[PDB]
Each structure stands twice: as structure tokens, then as C-alpha cells.
Amino acid sequence: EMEKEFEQIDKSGSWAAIYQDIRHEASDFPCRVAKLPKNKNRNRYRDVSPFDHSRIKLHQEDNDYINASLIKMEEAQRSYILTQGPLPNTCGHFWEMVWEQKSRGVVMLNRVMEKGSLKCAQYWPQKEEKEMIFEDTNLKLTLISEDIKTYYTVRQLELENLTTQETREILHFHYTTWPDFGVPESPASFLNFLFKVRESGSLSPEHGPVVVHSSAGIGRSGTFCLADTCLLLMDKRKDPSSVDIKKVLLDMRKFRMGLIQTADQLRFSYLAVIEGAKFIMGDSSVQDQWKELSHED
């Protein structure tokens, strides 16, 4: 059980060590392209890059680079694209990637401004009268409507390939209360938000991979993804005990570096998967409790 392990680590107060071990066993693949001099201004953080093997390639004959990675979870049969918070010169690229990869949803786990600094460009329109047109990638983006809650907002955006005039609806799930390098207020609010994304179809296989991002695209992003895959893995068999969280986090780190930034985010991942397992096991009432506990309205 992950719960027995949880209790053992907790009793022994060894989340730091456990996490140092993950950091030490994590894959290390080259990030040659991320490091090319022509891509310097396309990376927000010097120490956070996409491995070449899993990076998302833009279909432009100019510079196909974007700081984004495809986390392809074989056994769980679910993919996600983790990316950094778009920079002012990479918002067109970001939306280009969304169009090309056929994503239906974008999960934003950070705020534009955090800790007195700009952690991500304002890459989507905050009002409907004012659409965005990314000239470099020939795309148009319009806010259609938004549903603001206490700690998150869900937006319905319309993305148009100005070249073909094809149009797509993109859902934007914005978690506005998760501290950079922190953990959510409670498993309840996080699971409530996670099920909002799930219930939307965004995570479905009929669509391209959902784009998940934070500021670096690894801390809060990794946390979100780890919990989801773990819950999906136990869902296929209705067997929470067959899931090894550390092992799952490690398979994910083969696709992108630094997934889950602190020992507490790791600990929070366990709490979230343990609590979410109640639902997986047939107690669907727990979903209503998360809503309550979340205090979304």
C-alpha cells in the first residue's frame, strides 16, 4: 500500500531522503536543442529544459523549438504535454503547439504574477472584445466565456488557424491558488480541480494530449500529472495496491526533468492519490465532499 508507506515515511519523518533518492535516480538525457544559442530567449529558466528525445517539435520550417515535453505514460495509456509558462515571444509558438498537437484543454497551475515577479506571459485574452492574434504563427484566440470560482477559473476559448480559418474550442482550467513550490490548500480542492478537468473530456484519448503548465512546467505540473496517472492506473484494475507512486514519478522523469520540486509536493501527491482512491473504489459521494470542502463558490 501507498498508505502504509505514507505512514512509515511520515512516522520516520523521511520525506526529504525519499525525495533526494528520486532526484538521484532520475533519468538524465541530453537537451542539445534547448541549449542551442538560437533558442536561449525561448527558455524561461536556464536550468529547466526539454530532453531532445521527448521535446515537442513545432511544425514550422523556421525554428521548431519550444520548451515543452510529451509525457507519454504507456501503461496508464495517457499523455500530457508539460511546458513552461509562455514567454512574450513564445505565445504564438504555445498556441501553435496546441493547434498542431490537437489539444482540447490547457491546465494552468500558476499565476502570471507570483512573488513580485512575472512568471508567465498573459497568453490568453482576459476579455471577449479583445481577441489575440499571434502574427508569427497565424492564429487567433478569443475568450468566449469564463466561469470564475474561488480558487480556479474555467475559460472557454476559441482558437482559429487564420490560414485555414478552421476553428477549435479550447478549455482553460486555471488553478489560481497554488503557491510556486508549495502544495494545494488540501487534497480536496486539488482533486476537485482535477475532476473538473477530467469531466470536461480534455484528458480523453479522442483528443491530443492536454497541455499542462506552471511557470517552469515541472513542479506543480508534475504534481498534477503524477496524481492523475496514479489514479488512472488504479482505475484500470480497481487496484490501488498495484500502484507504486515513486516508480510512476520516475517513469515520468524519463520524459521531462525535475517533475515535482519539493519533498512536500511529493508528500501531497500521496495524500491526493490516497484520497482520490476512495472515488476510484466506488464511493462516488466523496466527489461531492471535495466540492464542499473546496469552497469553490
Ligand X SMILES: N[C@@H](Cc1ccc(OP(=O)(O)O)cc1)C(=O)O
Per CB under 6 A, residues contacting ligand X are 45, 48, 110, 180, 214-221, 261
- What is the closest distance, in whole angstroms, from the C-beta atom of residue 187 to ligand X in the complex? 18
- What is the closest distance, in whole angstroms, from the C-beta atom of residue 2 to ligand X in the complex? 22
65 or 178: whose CB is closer to ligand X?
A: 178
92 or 219: whose CB is closer to ligand X?
A: 219
Chain residue whose CB lies nearest ligand X: 219
- What is the closest distance, in whole angstroms, from the C-beta atom of residue 183 to ligand X in the complex? 11
- What is the closest distance, in whole angstroms, from the C-beta atom of residue 89 to ligand X in the complex? 19
End-to-end CA distance of the chain: 35
124 or 175: whose CB is closer to ligand X?
A: 175
Compute how many other C-beta atoms are within 10 angstroms of the C-beta atom of residue 146: 16
Query: Does an H or E element contain 101, and which?
Result: helix 91-101
Breaks (C-N over 2.5 A) in the chain follow: none
48 or 277: whose CB is closer to ligand X?
A: 48
Compute how many other C-beta atoms are within 10 angstroms of the C-beta atom of residue 150: 13
